[PDB]
Design a protein around this ligand. Structure first.
Ligand SMILES: [Zn+2]
Ligand SMILES: [Zn+2]
Ligand SMILES: [Zn+2]
Length: 205
């Protein structure tokens, strides 16, 4: 089942929402849809802004859909990781992260990682680029969860290795399966600028 919400502003007609219903605050599972249409997977593009509310909340988040590009990725990010002012490289970097992360998993980096953990890994790789999140201690990430029996040692080992592959600057060059001709993602610009702009996990027509 998908929600069907109509925006008060037709310029921002997409509903964005957190579909995670569980008890662990570490997890989110963001989606967008359009007046009851099939839904699409999304990610937070702004680490320092609020995540979309849970589906069916009394407060609803609406969005305008924009084609992804290096320009858009720069403009809608708070602190993007750009080398030598090269927005084409920023575009390539983000596209290759998404293509290799949840759900496309084009080179198997995600294999065996439970969906919510795979989203969490991919989300961290996106923030490495959108917010210049440092990620200098990947071998210790989620150790608190391991110690407390919340994520298995086995899942966390997979997650750490996947994250390292996703943030390698040579990902595009070394991955065997390359992004397809015409590959495109979308930015969702929040109608309420206290909430995150979103990045799709596939093309959203
Ligand atoms: Zn939350
Ligand atoms: Zn490398
Ligand atoms: Zn604005």
């Amino acid at each position: 089942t998908v929600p069907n919400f109509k925006s008060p502003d037709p310029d921002y007609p997409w509903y964005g929402y957190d579909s995670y219903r569980g008890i662990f605050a570490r997890y989110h599972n963001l989606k967008v849809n359009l007046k009851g249409s099939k839904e699409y997977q999304a990610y937070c593009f702004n680490l320092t802004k609020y995540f979309p509310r849970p589906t069916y909340s009394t407060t609803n988040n609406f969005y305008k859909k924009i084609d992804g590009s290096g320009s858009a990725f720069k403009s809608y990010a708070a602190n993007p990781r750009v080398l030598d002012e090269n927005l084409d490289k920023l575009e390539k970097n983000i596209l290759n992260v998404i293509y290799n992360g949840y759900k496309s998993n084009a080179n198997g980096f995600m294999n065996g990682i439970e969906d919510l953990n795979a989203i969490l890994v991919t989300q961290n790789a996106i923030w490495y680029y959108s917010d210049s999140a440092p990620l200098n201690d990947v071998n210790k990430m989620w150790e608190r969860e391991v110690r407390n029996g919340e994520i298995s040692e086995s899942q966390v080992t997979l997650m750490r290795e996947a994250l390292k592959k996703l943030i390698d600057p040579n990902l595009e060059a070394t991955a065997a399966n390359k992004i397809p001709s015409g590959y495109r993602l979308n930015i969702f610009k929040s109608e309420n600028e206290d909430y995150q702009n979103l990045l799709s996990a596939e093309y959203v027509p």
